[PDB]
Amino acid sequence: DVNDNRPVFVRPPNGTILHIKEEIPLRSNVYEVYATDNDEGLNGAVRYSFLKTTGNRDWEYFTIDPISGLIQTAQRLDREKQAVYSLILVASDLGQPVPYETMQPLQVALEDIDDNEPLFVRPPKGSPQYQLLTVPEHSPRGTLVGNVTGAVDADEGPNAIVYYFIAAGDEDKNFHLQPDGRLLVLRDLDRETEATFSFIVKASSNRSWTPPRGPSPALDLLTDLTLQEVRVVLEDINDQPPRFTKAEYTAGVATDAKVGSELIQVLALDADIGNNSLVFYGILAIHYFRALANDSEDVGQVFTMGSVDGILRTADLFMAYSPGYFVVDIVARDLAGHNDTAIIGIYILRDDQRVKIVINEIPDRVRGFEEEFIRLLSNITGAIVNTDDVQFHVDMKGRVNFAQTELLIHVVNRDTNRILDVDRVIQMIDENKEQLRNLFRNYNVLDVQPAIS
């Protein structure tokens, strides 16, 4: 005879796609091909063989015996590496004068197995290695903080259900994490009390997963990628009131009292942050007490307080009311109702209470540093030094030096919240002489004494 027919392919059937499991042993059987060459004799016996596809190297994954046609694995088959492997089979007759060949396409597709487990994916180094959620403080029960996420099981389908659970770190049980990944608030939280919480969440496919018995291996966020740190930070609300530094403030005013003079600066604190911390001040009423009297004479608005400055300022000349003092009731309020009260005592200082500080610089320059000098001095003296005026120096003899400057001041004892006799202030200066001796010279000071008899 002569090779007259080409082989034909009984199995595998035309354009078929075999499905096997993944990660099966090497050289594990897959399929047994069969083809028929009608020709009798060797011209019609078939010999099976894959084809070294040009770009497709998939054939490297299997072996097929030349006679038996049995297809066996040759490499590992991880669906996770490649899913469909595609091959072109070839059946040749042994016939002569030339053998004939027949090519049948085939494809192998792997079925997924629970090969892997749900795993997290860390963020870039340095960058925060955790996940942040935010929720308003004093939030109510149930308020969704937010949705944990960040895991994935390489697997497909049911082999990759990913449920989240809290592994450790809510010992106080402020939240609950429904497996879906929703974090719910359970308790009152107060930024001012605790600000950030944190804990470790587990990702497992086990809807019944329960934390290990507590003394077990402590966890390692650096190795276990089934774990992620989650940090909840509390947003702020206006839940804190303004709180005055003191509840009696005392400062002195001079009869000679340039209108608009800054007497003292109060302050109030709102623990709150941002707008909620904005504090606005003001004056509730003013009482005038003439020398010794138990009638609070109630003269006009004689003072002003900056709504934001907190600096009480003169509004009249007090040369009129020489004997006596004032009680100013003040208020501080936040953007939203929280309020606090206090009391300022302004006392018209007697000469007996007022001191001068001579300085060998032009008065202009003395104003240049007045604040600094006083701040330093008050610190070192540990007492409130309040600058009252800056004028040119006058010798007791009545000489006036147009390069020497005076600095009338009055002092209060933080401790007694009470004003000071010149006497006691001189003594204080002398006591601290040594500590102070540095300041005075650094600032061209020349002497100290009261309002000229």
Binding site for Ca ion (CB under 5 A): 3, 37, 39, 43-44, 78, 80, 93, 95, 112-115, 153, 155, 159, 236-240, 270, 272, 276, 334, 338
Alpha-carbon gap, residue 271 to 240, rounded angstroms: 6
**Cβ 395 to Ca ion, closest distance in Å?**
54
Task: Compute the Cα dihedral for 108, 109, 115, 117 and give only its sign.
Answer: positive
* Closer to Ca ion by Cβ: residue 5 or 265: 5
Alpha-carbon gap, residue 82 to 18, rounded angstroms: 15
**Cβ 22 to Ca ion, closest distance in Å?**
5
Q: Which residues contact 382 (CB under 8 A, 6 or more apart)?
A: 414
**Cβ 242 to Ca ion, closest distance in Å?**
6
Tokens 């009423």: give the residue. Answer: 285
**b/e per residue, 311-348, with b = 16+ CB within 10 A?**
ebebeeebeebeeebbbbebbbbbeeebebebbbbbbb
Contact 368, 382 (CB under 8 A): no
Residue nearest to Ca ion (CB): 115
Structure tokens at 2: 């002569």
* Closer to Ca ion by Cβ: residue 276 or 391: 276
Beta bridge partners of 85: 108
**Cβ 91 to Ca ion, closest distance in Å?**
10
Structure tokens at 163: 């449920």
Alpha-carbon gap, residue 78 to 85, rounded angstroms: 11
Question: DSSP for 207-275?
Answer: TT--PPPTTS----TTT-TTEEEEEEEEEP-S---EEES-SEEEEEE-SS--TT-EEEE--EEESS-GG
**Cβ 328 to Ca ion, closest distance in Å?**
23
* Closer to Ca ion by Cβ: residue 35 or 358: 35
Instruction: Give, in order, the Cα–Cα distances in Å from 152 to each of 81, 117, 163, 215, 409.
Output: 16, 8, 10, 29, 74
**Cβ 424 to Ca ion, closest distance in Å?**
41
Alpha-carbon gap, residue 277 to 30, rounded angstroms: 74
**Cβ 206 to Ca ion, closest distance in Å?**
10
* Closer to Ca ion by Cβ: residue 145 or 359: 145
Contact 347, 252 (CB under 8 A): yes
Question: Alpha-carbon Rg of the chain, whole angstroms?
Answer: 46
**Cβ 190 to Ca ion, closest distance in Å?**
7
* Closer to Ca ion by Cβ: residue 40 or 248: 40
**Residue 223, number of CB atoms within 10 A of its CB:** 7
Q: Which residues contact 413 (CB under 8 A, 6 or more apart)?
A: 383, 384, 420
**Cβ 20 to Ca ion, closest distance in Å?**
13
* Closer to Ca ion by Cβ: residue 105 or 136: 136
DSSP helix/strand/coil, 151: strand
**Cβ 280 to Ca ion, closest distance in Å?**
11
* Closer to Ca ion by Cβ: residue 237 or 394: 237
* Closer to Ca ion by Cβ: residue 155 or 170: 155
* Closer to Ca ion by Cβ: residue 67 or 292: 67
* Closer to Ca ion by Cβ: residue 270 or 388: 270
* Closer to Ca ion by Cβ: residue 58 or 236: 236
**Cβ 39 to Ca ion, closest distance in Å?**
4
